Structures are given as structure tokens and as C-alpha cells.
Design a protein around this nucleic acid. Sequence first.
DNA 1: CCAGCGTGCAGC
DNA 2: GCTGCGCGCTGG
Length: 142
Amino acid sequence: WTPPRSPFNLVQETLFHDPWKLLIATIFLNRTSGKMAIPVLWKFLEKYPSAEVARTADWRDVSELLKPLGLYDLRAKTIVKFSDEYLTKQWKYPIELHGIGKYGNDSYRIFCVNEWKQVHPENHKLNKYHDWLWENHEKLSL
DNA sequence: CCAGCGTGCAGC
DNA sequence: GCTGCGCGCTGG
Ligand SMILES: [Mg+2]
């Protein structure tokens, strides 16, 4: 399953091969514009390339990097705990994990697994992608 | 200048 | 069902 590239350029389209990275991106996008969040995301992932590294980080350090995005202490703590659970808790869908709600879960189900036909998003950007998928999947041969 | 907002979520 | 978290951007 390869989710198609869309005219809406969701960052999920490029991150789907690594579900942890895609989920971290959703967290970075919580009430934060992609224009701001996505550049900080690459800096984050250079320092913390995997859940293994993030799980062991001090959230106060992560917070310093997240500062210009807002929600910096909240999300720093989320990222550490989410990363821990990702690796050590039994889960089938990531909504079961701390920090991931319907938006992150719907992202995972559209991009990381082939469940897009079952997903009913309530996030505007995801709905633009998901609507467009229904309208074009025949042409794309999905 | 400055009110509103951005691909939310947990805790309550 | 509501609230705290939160910055820089955005555009009048
Ligand atoms: Mg969750």
C-alpha cells in the first residue's frame, strides 16, 4: 500500500513508510501550521531519529526545540510518553496510545495501512485528501 | 498594530 | 460537554 500523492501536499504522504514518524508529524501539527511545524520536524528527527531515542529523552530538552511552535511542554511530554508506549505497549491502532486521537489515528489508517475506505475523517485537511481519494482511486487503479 | 488561527489532545 | 496548552503566522 502506497498512498498516492495529492494536489494538497499532506506531509503524511511522504512519511507513511515509518509510522512513528508519521504519528510524530501529526503531533507537531496539533493546532500548529505545517509551514512552521514541518521545518522543526526535520530538526527534531535528526536529534531523535526513532522512538527508541525519543523514549529516553528529557522532555525539557525536547521542549526547547518545540518552543517556537507553542504547546511546547505539553507536546514534549507527549512525545516522550507516546514513543515509550509505541514500543512497549500492545496496540493495534495508535489511538490506543497517549497523544494520538482520532486525527492521528485516521492519518495512520489512511496512510500506513490500507484502511482508507473505512475511515471517516473530521479533520479538514484529511477530508480534502480522503474525498479526493474516493474521486480518483479508479483513475489511479486503487 | 492586533484578534484570530493552525492538518488536537488529554484531563476533567 | 469544557478547558489548558501556546507559539509565530496571517491579514485587516
Ligand atoms: Mg490516544
